[PDB]
Design a binder for this molecule. Structure first.
Ligand SMILES: c1ccc(-n2cccc2-c2nc(N3CC3)nc(N3CC3)n2)cc1
Ligand SMILES: c1ccc(-n2cccc2-c2nc(N3CC3)nc(N3CC3)n2)cc1
Ligand SMILES: c1ccc(-n2cccc2-c2nc(N3CC3)nc(N3CC3)n2)cc1
Ligand SMILES: c1ccc(-n2cccc2-c2nc(N3CC3)nc(N3CC3)n2)cc1
Ligand SMILES: c1ccc(-n2cccc2-c2nc(N3CC3)nc(N3CC3)n2)cc1
Ligand SMILES: c1ccc(-n2cccc2-c2nc(N3CC3)nc(N3CC3)n2)cc1
Lengths: 161, 161, 161, 161, 161, 161
């Protein structure tokens, strides 16, 4: 089964948006969000990847308790959230903790409840509503096979360099 | 100057929606919100009032640090958020702490920054997006004179009974 | 379907053990726990009940986010944790929030994962290990039909008085 | 040994100052403190007392973990902090949890370390520095015998009424 | 306009005092404060500077929500807090987040309210009261032009080396 | 007196178990604990050591307020918790903050109260009860002289390499 390390930038329930400077590895505060919304899951990027937009591939990790910015988590994909914004393509791979038997019944996107997927969709659709010249469109949930394919080629793109 | 006590139901930054049973005075959990949003200010109702919808008049209080559910706060109005939802009319009076000199430059709705008012508007417009058969419309900010008038008549309505 | 109000005494993740004085309705700190353990779910009692030990019937409520001590929650039973301690019988009804469609797939004790039930069992078995003259025994999970029966007779016992 | 119930108004580490309305029993926010200071211990008043200033006798309770406003704690005195402010006399009885063997080596004011007593003194001396027309003077730590005497007469004063 | 990166050592509302080892870049706990006081703003140092005392130039950053130790924040100066302690000179540049339109009305020290500046002054004047052989004196607020000048020469001093 | 730097991995009161990758220095989430237990003290490892099991020597640090993962703390030993688990030997040195006069009365294991040592023992004995093929045995508290000896040889082992 596929497995990778996700560096968590943003803990769940945060209104601060943290980034990592990929040159130095330092955590940076991007901004305090302009809307009254909180990140629905722990958010980060997959280590040693180069995604479809020239930045590392983003990842959502379902955790029982949040972690701190900069922490590594061994994760496995169960699906992916596909979206296009002002950057360009900006897809997020949905993951669970790898090697944890408490998440063994979550194998594909159908195993995740609709209310949770709807909530995650709602965040990314609406969190930049009050920022001018920033939108999102083409929001769509896809299965694990599609998620594994995008991880695979993002590792290939990274190795070429 | 006008002054009243607000019973805070919901602290700022909460995703739990608390109500008060007005018969008993007990705090009740209404629901965990279906959207990934947090209450932008401390939220409650004005004591000894009966609003335009047959329930007590709601109030938003700007606090530097949040309080707990059930706590009283002496407040004064600076404006009001006017809205209509599935209940009917459901206006919220915007307030600051009374007798605190740190809020003396906030006297009317123009003194509150646009980014804060936009954020408060955004919460109430979008927080019930994933609940079916629940909407809001006619969202509008009004000045202190209009807010003081609605408080005044809500006290009259309450005394008649 | 059966439904009742649970008054939450202890939030999830707390090491403080709160009780309610049933004469006054006041929240009281019983004690800070002697073991390094935290309450695995939100813990309280069902209103207007008199259980098999002469005190109100205890209840465990599965919540996504914890509440404060004294808060009411409309709940429905899905099972029960049966145990005997130094008090005598001391059963806890396992519940979920009533009227919430996100918990509709949890109807009986089989729908709750083993890891969660094992964790809840582990707390009540071990949390009084360092308190002398305090034990527990006969720890056992039972189904909803058994839970509904104990609620039913505890309401009957309460009405007789 | 002497024992009494303390109603905790203010948790440890808080910058919000809560009071209780003694007519209704409701918790009220007095104010957010003007200095960058936090309450060094859990703070409240002893139930059914009338102190040397016409209000209930205040109490500081040493707890391992803080509680919520309005919670009762069975406590026993080990000393008292004597002070005079703009109100008049305003003494605070230092207490530990009663019936807890982990506090059995704390019997009198000498058993409490100097650094903790100095820190508690520092709070009450300096927390109203930026509020005009508010001071404190005659700050002094006294032993348990003196504390027990003030509790005793404050109960007598309360019973006369 | 002037702009720089501040590495936040201490979040707002903390009683732990963190430092950074400038050789390694590791966060270190200096000490738990001896007084019952909390840091009034987020506190750190400006990257790539060498101040008037041979250490990096300290900075206070006004944030709506606190960050974690080690996080970078792009900031711009609006003033400076001038003080002398047992180290020697130990000035702190007051900043707001750069490129955030919500702070555009804060351009100079006059735009910051007196209550906030008084509170920040109060912390640094009193937080070492219970530490022997440690004082502060010559506490004074100065404008942006003075702050920009000290940043400018601290960058020059750093480049010389 | 002996003194060393402890890198804190796990803050007190956490159910997340963090490790450090000793190759990179990155913090990693090992797992969310399977039992409803929280870490009784701040937990980490001593820098530049190689213990009796081929990994760095673990350390428990008594702090008044918890720190974040990755933070350095100058500590001194007062005792050691000796235990054998599925790894092999896995001893933990009990420490207090070095150069802090508030901990000067804690010099050896006898100065630490029995309730605290019992609680720490209880955590490590029971926290892996629900993980299969994981046990602990030979749990025993030893004095400072024994702790200093194990630190001494773990530094020797580290220097050989
Ligand atoms: C499927 C996927 C996720 C969830 N879900 C939503 C909120 C929390 C969870 C959750 N949370 C957990 N853990 C670690 C405590 N486990 C699961 N399980 C697959 C059975 N689900 C429920 C069903
Ligand atoms: C006008 C009204 C509110 C705000 N505002 C937005 C977030 C926090 C505040 C705030 N917060 C405070 N306090 C108590 C710490 N005071 C004020 N002032 C009127 C000057 N504003 C700023 C300007
Ligand atoms: C069955 C029962 C409970 C859980 N469980 C364990 C931790 C959190 C949950 C949980 N949490 C949630 N909510 C409100 C966010 N929903 C559910 N679901 C029935 C599908 N489960 C998972 C499966
Ligand atoms: C005497 C009195 C108080 C303290 N002290 C200061 C901070 C925490 C404590 C404290 N905290 C505790 N508990 C419950 C965890 N127990 C004690 N003991 C009397 C031995 N002290 C230490 C010595
Ligand atoms: C001037 C400078 C600072 C403040 N002040 C004090 C506490 C919070 C604030 C504050 N907080 C905010 N944000 C981000 C939420 N914005 C501002 N504004 C310049 C209008 N002020 C108020 C007026
Ligand atoms: C001996 C060793 C530890 C403790 N103890 C247990 C919980 C907190 C403490 C504690 N906590 C503290 N600090 C920093 C606030 N100081 C001490 N003292 C040696 C006197 N003890 C009490 C007695």
């Amino acid at each position: 089964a596929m497995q990778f390390d996700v560096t968590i930038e943003i803990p769940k329930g945060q209104r601060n948006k943290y980034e990592v400077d990929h040159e130095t590895g330092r955590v940076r505060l991007d901004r305090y969000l302009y809307t009254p919304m909180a990140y629905p899951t722990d958010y980060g990027f997959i280590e040693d990847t180069l995604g479809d937009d020239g930045d590392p591939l983003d990842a959502l990790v379902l955790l029982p308790q949040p972690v701190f910015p900069g922490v590594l988590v061994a994760a496995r994909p169960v699906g992916m959230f596909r979206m296009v914004d002002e950057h360009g393509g900006d897809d997020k791979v949905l993951c669970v903790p790898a090697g944890d038997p408490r998440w063994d019944h979550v194998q594909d996107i159908g195993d995740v409840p609709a209310f949770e997927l709807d909530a995650i969709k709602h965040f990314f659709v609406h969190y930049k509503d009050l920022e001018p010249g920033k939108f999102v469109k083409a929001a769509d949930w896809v299965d694990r096979a599609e998620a594994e394919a995008e991880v695979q080629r993002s590792v290939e793109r990274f190795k070429a360099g």
